[PDB]
Amino acid sequence: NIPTLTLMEEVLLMGLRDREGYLSFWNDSISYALRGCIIIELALRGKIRILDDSARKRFDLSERLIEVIDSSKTGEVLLDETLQLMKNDEPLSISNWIDLLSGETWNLLKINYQLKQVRERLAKGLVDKGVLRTEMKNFFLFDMATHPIADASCKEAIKRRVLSVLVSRNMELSYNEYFPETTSFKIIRTLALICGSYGANVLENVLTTLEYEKRDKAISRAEEIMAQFSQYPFDLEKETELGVSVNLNKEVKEEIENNPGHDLQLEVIAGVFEVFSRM
Template structure:
């Protein structure tokens, strides 16, 4: 006879046995419901913006009414993988390996390690973080190549993240920024994602233009990018460099006259060169007379986040990859 016996439990015992999963949350009818406390914590976190960096870059590339990217853009897929590493670094998930010998190498050739493997709540970020957690430390450039599928190592070809642009677009649909429509392209139907919330995209454009056009930079905040966001300036610079690397920055500057647009591109070149080294070259003054207060503001942000210097070093490494993308692709 089996030594296992069934024990009858009353209702109160059965509820208490589920306490690790079911919390004292109720629905509209007063019934207890189950929820994930980690998910609730992520949802209430105001230190990260509502849109991640990849979504912002993709949104800059999408045509507003048509809802798709230019068919001639070969850069954006690779640049989005770099943005994934930046986003993970700014969220405190990865950093450059703290090895004194690393300074002998270019910043993009320094090893990356995972320092916090907890979930971010973003599927793409969690997928990339899981790959990095289960592998040995590799360089920044190596990880961007692997996530893009640009590798000759057949043992790691499965590291390629699939359908990144479509998944990001669907995320923007879930967040109410885009909508999904089917459009016929002669021989086949393809889902497109026209913009629904134009104020979101315009706010992102204004944030970029405040750095690339205005003499004194001043960021504007909204529900998608509140003032409580950590690394507000570094995130904005990452957006500019990511859009530059993805070849979608011109979409933001297209409304400017020729002279202003040319100066804005020159300022973007300056920023990319200035911040693709670490420590950042904050003693280098701009020659364009645009966003002259940028260095001071970034210096204050870096000083207030001294414990994150290795994370910012990872950001600089991705910028260096963006600065030589024309020779990579």
């Protein structure tokens, strides 16, 4: 079922350089996308679902309310702690959750939902996972913890998956220890990766190698897939004019068919995609 790295962690990984240091200066765009991954992640793990009233249809996807379906611990603190919050509140919309957890809306009687030390906790988790090691750099006025990458294969595998969907003619996802051949919702997870990393604005980081025609094609293909998968139900009949991942429609159809009765959750991820494009 569930892969080793969460989406938040793959997105974080997306902003780092292969050896030491970083590519993206830390902005609140990335910090907002990560809250998005959290919500996507909750839906994937069958813990939340779009609130089941047909009256939601009069509203945008991202304006639609979410329902805690299962409040049992998940393992992941960031996930668990937002879950906690959800279990104790009226059904709120996707957009509202993302705001509150970002500290981007202001609410008095909500004090407070804003998630704290996300960056740092994601990093600690990433050490425990063994993706990052810890190095103690020595500065002029203090010592400092530092987390350069330990396993390069991890970042490389993510890169290839992403490219598999957005440069290569036929998407063929590769697998490994962190992301096995048997993870449920495999294609949606990687789509979710691209859509997250687009709105965190860290997606272009994996594209800097490529020749110019291919970097263009990847970005447009990316916004193409954002257009499709931020409406519900998905438009799986619309064919790509580009020469890129021409079999995604087929491969998704085969995936949702073999995970039936999950529609009430796929719709939340779509709302989240909607928020990523609006950002």
